[PDB]
A paper describes a structure:
In fungi, plants, protozoans, and some metazoans, sRNA production often depends on template-dependent RNA synthesis catalyzed by cell-encoded RNA-dependent RNA polymerases (RdRPs). In the filamentous fungus Neurospora crassa, silencing, or “quelling,” of transgenic arrays relies on RdRP QDE-1, PIWI/PAZ protein QDE-2, DNA helicase QDE-3, and several other components, including the ssDNA-binding protein RPA. Interestingly, QDE-1 may trigger quelling by producing long aberrant ssRNA copies (aRNAs) of ssDNA intermediates that frequently arise in tandem-duplicated genomic sequences. QDE-1 can subsequently use its aRNA product as a template to produce dsRNA intermediates.
To this end, we determined QDE-1Tte three-dimensional structure using x-ray crystallography. In each dimer, the two monomers are related by a non-crystallographic dyad. For example, the QDE-1Tte dimer had a pyramidal shape with a pair of double-ψ β-barrel domains (DPBB1 and DPBB2; residues 312–413 and 535–639) located at the base of each subunit. The “head” (residues 457–507 and 822–1006 of the catalytic fragment) and the “neck” domains (residues 428–532 and 784–821) of the two subunits adopted a slightly tilted back-to-back position, and the “slab” domain (residues 1–244) of each subunit protruded from the catalytic domain toward the corresponding head domain. The five domains formed an extensive groove, probably accommodating the template and the nascent RNA product, with the catalytic site located at the bottom. Superposition of 922 Cα atoms between the two monomers (dimer A/B) using the SSM server returned a root mean square deviation of 2.15 Å. The largest conformational differences between the two monomers occurred closer to the C-terminal end of the polypeptide chain. The homodimer interface is stabilized by a total of 119 and 115 residues of monomer A and B, respectively. Most residues at the interface originate from the upper “neck” and “head” domains, where the subunits display the largest structural differences. However, it showed a striking bias toward generating short RNA products rather than full-length copies.
Author numbering: 22 to 212, 226 to 249, 263 to 565, 568 to 676, 678 to 812, 817 to 868, 876 to 894, 907 to 922, ...
């Protein structure tokens, strides 16, 4: 509708040749991927169809195929998972709760009658299912990441002609792909530098397989889908954009838990009201004890959660355990603030609890920098608070280094430390073992435990090396983000108190178990003040002090925080406009912080009405534009999609006014002047921009700053937006101080104290050397063999020349990193040898990686490139040096060699109880 665009927007999506029409979608999609990966044109027939395809494992279909030689080629692409692809033909797209996705990804192109957008079809991926995909079949949905067409900028034709035919292209008709008609329904914010994207959800309305009609695969429009989900005749009263936003409830990624009976769902008509006006339980309502037992059962938690975040048809938010239920019937209640459209809750998938997230066990959280200036403002003593905060930074940091340098002195304990600092557990479960990247584990802290399990020390330069990398990389996190750890703080779910036990400024926090703070332990909080705060805190009052009081009534509500239902304003609200619908709280009970805090009073949101303008046009006025009947209802849906998209794709000002605030407050060295309450208010209203259909745009933004602020022009980036310190004097600003003056120096200092220390080795005995005589014991033995040789001799010499060329390969390969590491591993694993040439290789062993040659390969590798390329041999052979180092450091009769298989090994962990008691005996 320009036209520039058209013709552009061609041919963005590839077509569908008659040889692929046979079905199914699975191979059709993955074959489309192969063809454009291999840059083969799909409009070359001379091709056919194979029934074996309907059965196999892509590599099977991918080895067809290829043959053909022009499919040689190449190989790849990334390829879908084992459980996924088989389900993509014969498992109907689903494993228990995890659906199979179709996901494409769009980035810009330049010219024309050229595309404009470049497709990237990711392979079939398992994700969790939502309600629509569960209802209509996961095969009928597509999600693409699309660049926003109002993100300036881009290549020039983009927005040279600002407009927006782009959006009209996405919404108006379908998009023909792999035989199907995909029609857009929802558009959301994305869940040197590249550009920002919009996630767009298409629903396949028809295609090559399809058949009518009300009252597989049937024909079925986006208009009927939403009519199912939303139930449209009973919801005309809604503003269409607000009804559009509600789509997000049917798309939310959730685990299905229980379907209730209509009686067992207790739809409350009123919210609990202020003693009085203000709802005191926004989004939160009780579930039964049994549903909570059930939710554990269903998902498999190691314990019943006291609270849950789900979805329940039209309902959304938090359910907590009713403590006053003792009994054995399942029930759940719902409240108005929960229920987001009028749902009759008829069919089963509107009656079923879909679980988003559970109450799980707290971890120490610390203090994000966003809260820093707020705290400084509400500090009693600002200097002492500065000194309070910085001190805690350096001590946790001292604490984690001294703990780690002491551990390193003793294998058992150095192993024990690594295990207490990360987790490959959820990765191990995944791949059935310790996933391995060439010759060594993927995760570094897994790499250490294996090389220590195999009997290595701080005699080995590589082991020293990795110990340093681990802690350094966790330092990096801290020097950028200022995630300043606070031993006495957690992130908790807010819950409200339905039983009237806590008073206006009283909260209840109990743990599900022993909370560790370094010195001391906790299992609840009583008779002590606590700071509560929802991220982000923008007002001085968005951080609130309250008294942590325990009530044994609520003993059973664990790992959450209970706010009162009493007084005028619910606490959740006081914390940056919160409510209880998933929102979590920064709960700090550190005395040194809390007691220097003094409460501020809730501001009044200033009159910003001339800039904030809700488009309240309803879904019923949109139908009335079509004249009556179901038809007028059918097109209204497409009116609304089309119009909601033009809104959805406007620039997210939320993030731009928040940036401006972070700059205007930093310069103005205030969070508590008048221009800060004006922005704080504004960024408040804009978090709801989506679901309120608010009109706030380039015009209003300029208009505002003209009339009420500075200061249109680029306000400066703050100093802490760099690495090293910019200006004149040791820093004044709290955040600059904390970054440049404290964190940087504290870290660099302690990084060095154990790079001192490496590095001291020379031959004092002590210290670290890549060289280890044990690790070349296969090499030397075979080198005098081979003296004395004949053609053995031929064996060794070509191995050594081979290895050379492989390390040469590493040199370049200095284009994805593990890929490179693998590419050149297989070239490493390719080095292959009357008489012992029958033995060493041992091809009754299925895979070259548990043979004796492999040792010799690696022990020889080591001597030649330990100089030199220590790394190169560890990333290829590391597990083969492990055999060696395990065999040789063993004497025999003082322990034999116990070989644990990958699964059994990934099933074992270091035994803290044993390490504590076994040192207790070594230090007699």
């Amino acid at each position: 509708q320009s036209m520039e665009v058209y013709a552009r927007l061609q041919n963005i999506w590839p077509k569908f040749p008659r040889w692929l029409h046979a079905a199914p979608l699975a191979l059709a999609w993955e074959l489309t991927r192969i063809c454009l990966h291999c840059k083969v044109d799909l409009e070359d027939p001379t091709l056919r169809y194979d029934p074996s395809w309907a059965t196999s494992d892509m590599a099977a279909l991918w080895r067809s195929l290829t043959q053909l030689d022009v499919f040689r080629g190449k190989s790849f692409p990334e390829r879908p998972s084992a459980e996924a692809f088989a389900a993509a033909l014969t498992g109907n797209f689903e494993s228990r709760g995890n659906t199979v996705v179709l996901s494409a990804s769009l980035e810009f192109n330049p010219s024309k009658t050229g595309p404009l957008f470049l497709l990237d079809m990711k392979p079939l991926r398992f994700d969790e299912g939502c309600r629509l995909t569960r209802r209509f079949g996961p095969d009928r949905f597509l999600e693409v990441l699309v660049p926003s067409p109002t993100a300036l900028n881009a290549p020039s034709i983009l927005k040279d002609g600002g407009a927006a035919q782009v959006i009209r292209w996405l919404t108006e008709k379908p998009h023909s792909l792999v035989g199907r008609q995909w029609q857009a329904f929802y558009t959301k914010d994305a869940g040197a530098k590249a550009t920002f994207k919009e996630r767009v959800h298409f629903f396949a309305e028809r295609g090559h397989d399809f058949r009518p009609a009300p009252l597989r695969r049937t024909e079925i429009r986006v208009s009927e889908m939403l009519d199912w989900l939303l139930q449209l005749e009973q919801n005309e009263y809604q503003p269409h954009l607000k009804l559009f936003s509600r789509i997000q409830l049917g798309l939310s990624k959730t685990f299905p838990t229980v379907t209730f009976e209509p009686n067992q769902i207790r739809h409350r008509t009123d919210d609990i009201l202020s003693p009085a006006g203000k709802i005191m339980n926004d989004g939160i309502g009780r579930m039964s004890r049994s549903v909570a037992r059930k939710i554990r059962d269903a998902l498999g938690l190691s314990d019943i959660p006291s609270a849950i975040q789900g979805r329940m048809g039209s309902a959304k938010g938090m359910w907590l355990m009713d403590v006053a239920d003792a009994g054995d019937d399942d029930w759940i209640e719902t409240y108005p603030s929960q229920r987001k459209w009028k749902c009759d809750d008829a069919d089963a998938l509107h009656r079923t609890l879909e679980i988003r997230s559970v109450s799980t066990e707290l971890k120490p959280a610390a203090l994000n920098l966003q809260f820093l200036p707020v705290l400084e403002d509400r500090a009693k003593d600002k200097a002492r608070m500065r000194r309070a905060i910085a001190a805690r930074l350096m001590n946790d940091l001292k604490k984690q280094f001294d703990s780690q340098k002491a551990a390193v002195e003793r294998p058992l304990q150095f192993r024990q430390w690594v295990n207490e600092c990360t987790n490959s557990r959820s990765e191990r479960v995944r791949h059935g073992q310790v996933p391995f990247l060439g010759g060594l584990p993927e995760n570094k802290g897994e790499v250490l435990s294996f090389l220590l399990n195999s009997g290595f020390d701080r005699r080995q330069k590589y082991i020293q090396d990795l110990a340093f990398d681990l802690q350094k990389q966790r330092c990096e996190v801290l020097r950028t983000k200022l995630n300043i750890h606070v031993g006495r703080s957690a992130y908790m779910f807010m819950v409200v108190d339905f039983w009237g036990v806590l008073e206006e400024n009283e909260v209840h926090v109990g743990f599900s178990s022993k909370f560790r703070d370094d010195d001391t332990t906790y299992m609840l909080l009583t008779d002590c003040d606590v700071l509560v705060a929802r991220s982000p805190a923008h007002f001085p009052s968005d951080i609130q002090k309250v008294r942590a009081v325990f009530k044994p009534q609520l003993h059973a509500l664990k790992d959450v925080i209970v706010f009162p239902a009493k007084g005028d304003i619910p606490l959740a609200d006081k914390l940056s406009g919160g409510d209880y619908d998933g929102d979590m709280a920064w709960v700090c009970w550190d005395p040194d912080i809390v007691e220097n805090f003094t409460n501020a009073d809730m501001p009044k949101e200033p009159d910003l009405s001339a800039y904030l303008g809700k488009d309240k046009t309803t879904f019923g006025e949109l139908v009335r534009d079509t004249g009556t009947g179901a038809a007028a209802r059918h097109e209204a849906v497409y009116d609304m999609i089309n119009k909601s998209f033009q809104f959805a794709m406007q620039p997210n000002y939320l993030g731009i006014c928040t940036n401006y605030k972070e700059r205007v407050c930093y310069h103005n060295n205030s969070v508590s002047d008048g221009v800060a309450l004006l922005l704080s208010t504004l960024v408040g209203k804009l978090v709801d921009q989506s679901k309120q259909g608010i009109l706030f745009d380039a015009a209003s933004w300029d208009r505002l700053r003209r009339e009420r602020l500075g200061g249109r022009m680029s306000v400066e980036d703050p100093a802490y937006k760099g690495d090293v310190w910019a200006g004149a004097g040791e820093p004044r600003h709290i955040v600059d101080y904390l970054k440049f003056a404290v964190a940087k120096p504290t870290i660099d200092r302690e990084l060095e104290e154990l790079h001192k220390v490496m590095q001291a080795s020379r031959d004092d005995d002590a210290a670290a050397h890549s060289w280890d005589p044990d690790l070349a014991v296969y090499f030397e033995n075979f080198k005098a063999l081979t003296a004395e040789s004949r053609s053995l001799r031929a064996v060794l010499e070509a191995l050594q020349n081979a290895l050379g060329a492989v390390e040469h390969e590493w040199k370049v390969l200095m284009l994805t990193y593990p890929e490179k590491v693998r590419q050149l591993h297989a070239k490493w694993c390719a080095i292959e040898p009357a008489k012992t040439a029958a033995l060493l290789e041992q091809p009754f062993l299925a895979d070259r990686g548990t043979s004796y040659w492999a040792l010799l390969r690696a022990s020889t590798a080591f001597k030649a490139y330990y100089k030199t390329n220590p790394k190169f041999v560890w990333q290829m052979a590391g597990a083969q040096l492990a055999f060696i180092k395990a065999q040789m450091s063993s004497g025999g009769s003082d322990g034999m060699p116990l070989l644990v298989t990958p699964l059994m090994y990934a099933g074992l962990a270091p035994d803290g109880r044993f390490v504590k008691q076994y040192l207790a005996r070594l230090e007699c």
